[PDB]
Amino acid sequence: PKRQTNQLQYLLRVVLKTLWKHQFAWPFQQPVDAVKLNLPDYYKIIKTPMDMGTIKKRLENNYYWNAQECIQDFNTMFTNCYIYNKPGDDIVLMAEALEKLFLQKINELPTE
Amino acid sequence: MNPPPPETSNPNKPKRQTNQLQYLLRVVLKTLWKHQFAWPFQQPVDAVKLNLPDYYKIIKTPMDMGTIKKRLENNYYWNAQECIQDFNTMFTNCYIYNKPGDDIVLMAEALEKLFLQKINELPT
Amino acid sequence: KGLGK
């Protein structure tokens, strides 16, 4: 039952937009191409791969019904990065700033 | 519609120039320097180490922040505008050599943004 | 050349 559309419109037009356009967005805007980056084992260590490209398409195609799903996809992206990469890595620092911003934005999420 | 009267303070006086060079060192370069992306720009490109044997054939005026820092610290520049040009050369070199979309290009662009934001606040 | 991935 009810598609949580108000919350999901907020996710697309406010939350996604903000992280999408952030200076640190680019490594996260598509799935990790493990070939191009020669991370042979990426897809053996990250079992639930997730990225903003995929989140974006989902929000744009009404893939989601619950807000919590979409929010959890973001959490999975950030965790995927921390588990695969050493703390301190450029990419970990980037993910950290994107996450803090996301947390900030999620705090004003509209209600069901 | 009467225009601004003529100059009565001379921009060539030494402190006016040194104040700008100081801002370029202490505010502008320093800000870029403390950015998470500075590190590939803190020294000349090491063609051998990174194994890019066309770099010095392609890029005719190499530039990096480490060299700019040295010039600012060692009486090289006449004025801020010369220094600004070295920055521009540093960014342009990166955009020329590398493919749009490479990590390094995206990192230079973030630097250039911050650079331009600080340059806008240069004292006059 | 990059973020170091």
Numbering used by the authors:
A (entry chain C): 56 to 167
B (entry chain A): 43 to 166
C (entry chain E): 1 to 5
Show passages lifted from the paper.
Bromodomains (BRDs) are protein interaction modules that specifically recognize ε-N-lysine acetylation motifs, a key event in the reading process of epigenetic marks. The four helices form a deep cavity that is extended by the two loop regions (ZA and BC loops), creating a largely hydrophobic Kac binding pocket.
To refer to specific sites, we chose the first BRD of BRD4 as a reference sequence for numbering of residues. The cocrystal structure of H47–17K8acK12ac with BRD4(1) revealed a canonical monoacetylated recognition mode, suggesting that the H49–11 linker sequence is not suitable for a simultaneous recognition of the two Kac by a single BRD. As reported for interactions with single acetylation sites in the case of the BRDs of BRD2 (Umehara et al., 2010), alanine mutants of the conserved asparagine (N140 and N443 in the first and second BRDs in BRD4) did also abolish binding of diacetylated peptides in both SPOT assays as well as in ITC.
